[PDB]
Amino acid sequence: MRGKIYDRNGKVLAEDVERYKLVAVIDKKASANSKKPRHVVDKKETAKKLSTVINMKPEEIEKRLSQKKAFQIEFGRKGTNLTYQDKLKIEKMNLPGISLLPETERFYPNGNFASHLIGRAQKNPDTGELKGALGVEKIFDSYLSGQPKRGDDVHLTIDSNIQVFVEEALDGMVERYQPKDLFAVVMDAKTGEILAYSQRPTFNPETGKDFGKKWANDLYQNTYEPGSTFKSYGLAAAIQEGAFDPDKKYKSGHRDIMGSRISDWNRVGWGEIPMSLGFTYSSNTLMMHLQDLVGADKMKSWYERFGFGKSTKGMFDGEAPGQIGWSNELQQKTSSFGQSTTVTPVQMLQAQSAFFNDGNMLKPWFVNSVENPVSKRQFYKGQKQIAGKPITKDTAEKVEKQLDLVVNSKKSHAANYRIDGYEVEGKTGTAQVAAPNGGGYVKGPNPYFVSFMGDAPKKNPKVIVYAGMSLAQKNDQEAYELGVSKAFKPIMENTLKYLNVGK
């Protein structure tokens, strides 16, 4: 009996269950008595009396009850997975030929729910043996797999209440923007526990609908050009190095890099503005400037020290390292605002954690334990671990003040992320998406990966929410303008209420 998969609070995300399959013996070959038949005689009337319990298709049933030289028949999917009452109901009616075989099915109480984390187990029909095909099911299969030995349970950090907030919000963003890719992740700011994680498009582990359309888990196995969320790590390196003074002025506008003209987003700039306002506006010239002040060799190192270009070493299979793009000054200067370099969303959460743990990066984790439920032996137990301390408490407190302004500055271009009654901070991102098949960047009206790396309450946050949407195929203009504010706001507002945060 395959092990359970539980959430933070012992609520069930996957379990084995006893269901029943319907079998009808149609062929008259059980004729040792016409008075005591063991096959289906009146087809019309046998068909009608189980319509009362099954899908109620008396014609489709009577149709299927008519085949060629087959003793037994099944009724595909609507005649598998039937309750223990559905058995006793059909057994009371004493129909001849009709029996119900027991079947052990894998059952996901919440259906489409953390589907790409939890994964799916598939049944060998010959043995009823279940094998994990993706996610926790696949990773921890040997632990979950079971004279009759009962398999070990896997406990996640996922909180079913928060996971719901995330599932509703991403459901809305698909109706509004129908994007090619989309994800949101809630993490405990102070522990690095994944409290909630979802992505679209995804599958239903229960029904199996859409399974194997996308193998890739967004949090761990998919890489992105992060965009301007990645500026927080460059700003931290610059604050530590001395390059960044919020009140010093810099020449905004553009820079000429290996002959190409990389410019601020409004193209003109704002002339000489303070570096604080530079960041608040998301000036690429500020970041290319700070890179010149600090040094190309010193900045590759600073990115490496924030955990980039190498795997977080988490519990997920085939975790992507990504890569720091640093082969020519065009790659380095574009890396400063999160193009060329590829990240995993989990790398970004590891990095971002440093601003709230006095400079200590938290290794993010979702598996809480693997225990036998009889013996109570923990074969594995996860905990808060430090992944690096790339910056000082001071650097961190100052990166925080900039993230506060990005949202709450009177000249903010990101007030769409404010939440009535809770103070929020973070950094926005709009980024070009590499074309799957070489061909530089995806073309179109606004062919962007919009993203936000927020946290609340500000300075001493309970949670970090990192949502990202890639290539909205509808309201693509509103996508560019609002990014992921329509997912961030509800996810964050409901998660703070549920953790009883004041206001």
Ligand X SMILES: *C(=O)[C@@H](NC(=O)Cc1ccccc1)[C@@H]1N[C@@H](C(=O)O)C(C)(C)S1
Task: Tell whether residue 495 is a contact of ligand X (CB under 6 A).
Answer: no
DSSP states of 169-196: HHHHHHHHH-EEEEEEEEEETTT-BEEE
Nearest distance from C-beta of residue 77 to ligand X, angstroms: 46
Nearest distance from C-beta of residue 236 to ligand X, angstroms: 16
Looking at residues 40 to 99 of the shown chain, list those that interact with ligand X (rule: CB under 6 A).
none
Task: Tell whether residue 228 is a contact of ligand X (CB under 6 A).
Answer: yes
Task: Tell whether residue 368 is a contact of ligand X (CB under 6 A).
Answer: no
CB 231 within 8 A of CB 287: yes
* Spatial distance between the Cα atoms of 68 and 451, rounded to a whole number of angstroms: 59
Nearer Cβ to ligand X, position 372 or 412?
A: 412
Q: Which two tokens stand for residue 379?
A: 């074969």
* Ramachandran category for residue 208: left, alpha or beta (phi over 0 → left; psi -120 to 50 → alpha): left
Nearer Cβ to ligand X, position 111 or 271?
A: 271
**One-letter amino acid of 437:** N
Looking at residues 229 to 268 of the shown chain, list those that interact with ligand X (rule: CB under 6 A).
265
Nearest distance from C-beta of residue 339 to ligand X, angstroms: 7
Q: Which two tokens stand for residue 494?
A: 């409901």
Nearer Cβ to ligand X, position 303 or 337?
A: 337
Nearer Cβ to ligand X, position 284 or 395?
A: 284
Cα-trace Rg, the chain: 28
Nearest distance from C-beta of residue 494 to ligand X, angstroms: 24
Nearest distance from C-beta of residue 107 to ligand X, angstroms: 42
Catalytic hit among 160, 228, 283, 336:
228
Nearer Cβ to ligand X, position 430 or 495?
A: 430
Task: Tell whether residue 343 is a contact of ligand X (CB under 6 A).
Answer: no
Looking at residues 377 to 436 of the shown chain, list those that interact with ligand X (rule: CB under 6 A).
428-431
Which residues are CB-neighbours of 80 under 8 A, at least 6 positions away? 19, 21, 22, 74, 103, 105
Of the residues 338, 345, 461, 468, which one makes contact with ligand X according to CB under 6 A: 338
With residue 222 as reference, give the H or E element that holds it: none
Of the residues 119, 227, 447, 461, which one makes contact with ligand X according to CB under 6 A: 227
Q: How many chain residues are in contact with ligand X, going by CB under 6 A?
A: 12
Nearest distance from C-beta of residue 248 to ligand X, angstroms: 21
Annotation says 451 is catalytic: no
**One-letter amino acid of 27:** D
Nearest distance from C-beta of residue 51 to ligand X, angstroms: 58
Nearest residue to ligand X on Cβ basis = 228
Nearer Cβ to ligand X, position 8 or 231?
A: 231
Tokens 């299969």 sit on residue? 141
Q: What is the DSSP letter of 215?
A: -
* Ramachandran category for residue 15: left, alpha or beta (phi over 0 → left; psi -120 to 50 → alpha): beta
Beta bridge partners of 106: 16
Task: Tell whether residue 448 is a contact of ligand X (CB under 6 A).
Answer: yes
* Spatial distance between the Cα atoms of 423 and 382, rounded to a whole number of angstroms: 31
The crossing angle, in degrees rounded to 10, of helices 284-294 and 231-241 is 40
Q: How far is CA 463 from the centre of its chain?
A: 16
Nearer Cβ to ligand X, position 157 or 283?
A: 283
Q: How far is CA 372 from the centre of its chain?
A: 27
CB 246 within 8 A of CB 275: yes
* Spatial distance between the Cα atoms of 471 and 463, rounded to a whole number of angstroms: 27
CA separation, residue 79 to residues 22, 122, 125, 147, 472 (Å): 5, 18, 15, 31, 40
Nearer Cβ to ligand X, position 26 or 453?
A: 453
Q: Nearest-CA neighbor of 347 among 179, 219, 183?
A: 219
Q: Which two tokens stand for residue 377?
A: 């032996």
Nearest distance from C-beta of residue 169 to ligand X, angstroms: 19
**E-strand stretches of 249-376:** 249-251, 254-257, 260-263, 272-274, 361-362, 367-371
Nearest distance from C-beta of residue 461 to ligand X, angstroms: 20
Map residues 318-337 to x or -, x wherever contact with ligand X holds by CB under 6 A: -------------------x
Q: Which two tokens stand for residue 50?
A: 């189980």
Nearer Cβ to ligand X, position 226 or 457?
A: 226
Of the residues 223, 282, 312, 347, which one makes contact with ligand X according to CB under 6 A: 282
Of the residues 157, 160, 252, 284, which one makes contact with ligand X according to CB under 6 A: 284
Q: Which residues are known to be catalytic?
A: 228
- List residues binding ligand X (CB under 6 A): 227-228, 265, 282, 284, 337-338, 428-431, 448
